[PDB]
Amino acid sequence: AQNPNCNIMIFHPTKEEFNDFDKYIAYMESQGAHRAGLAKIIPPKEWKARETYDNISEILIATPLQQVASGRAGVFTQYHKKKKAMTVGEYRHLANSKKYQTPPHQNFEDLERKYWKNRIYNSPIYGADISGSLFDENTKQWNLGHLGTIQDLLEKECGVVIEGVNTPYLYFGMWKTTFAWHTEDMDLYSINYLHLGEPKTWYVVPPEHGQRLERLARELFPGSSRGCGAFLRHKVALISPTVLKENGIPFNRITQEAGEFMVTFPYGYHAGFNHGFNCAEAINFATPRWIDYGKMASQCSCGEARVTFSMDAFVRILQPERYDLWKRGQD
């Protein structure tokens, strides 16, 4: 078995190997990459996502989210408070302000310490989930706006044509902006490209150990657990690496820098934070190996998780028994 300790693997494809996305994901899996739950892909030196980022300031963040925490430093939840609209120019200025800027630090490790020590005492503002793309239409390789769609994958594998569309999202981050512990909708893959700015640190639990994370989360968030059998779908809970180590949860960590791709694999729980002003783009995708995970994915039916138009058809076709109850939650 390849990669039995489930370590995060880093790949360096040649320009030739960067042509066929599907084939490269399948190569990574042949080397065991999926066992970790997350892989890093460094693009060939010849490649570029677009010519410059000099003209992005007028993009609108219609609903910036202030991430307010509750709990203790290592075990907390966050809620998203809606703020007034602002442009990317305005947001970048705010990120760089004395109130919100990254503090002086020695290295990534010192910054990670400071994050886990101090995150709960601040409420950073995240420009998340903005429909759109920063890839140039002429970038032919690994263009996240030009991937094969999940609807077409399900049709190719299973023969059923379904409604729905699949488009990328932009994330504008600042220091301490946080992504809570989650897997993707319907335990899909995700791909994330860090277009610009400061790094993003990731934590991941191997898919084969996901249920261990879920059991710990039920213990640490007992009211949430009673309210919903799949409350991590709400994307609000944080558990620190110290806490995971104390409870024997297997995980790994890695920092993504500007110009690098990360891929999350089906049922790979992940969480993390941004080091300072940055812009990432991400999208869900599928492969033939995803189908079985989609069929088994948990669902939130308490009504909190509330998801995209396109998830309807995935539930309807892959989880017909669940469909009725899940849709009650959606309505």
Ligand SMILES: O=C(O)CNC(=O)C(=O)O
């Ligand atoms: O970048 C973020 O805030 C969150 N991204 C992801 O969870 C992802 O790409 O799967």
Ligand SMILES: [Mg+2]
């Ligand atoms: Mg602009």
Ligand code: NI
């Ligand atoms: Ni994700």
Ligand SMILES: [Zn+2]
């Ligand atoms: Zn729920």
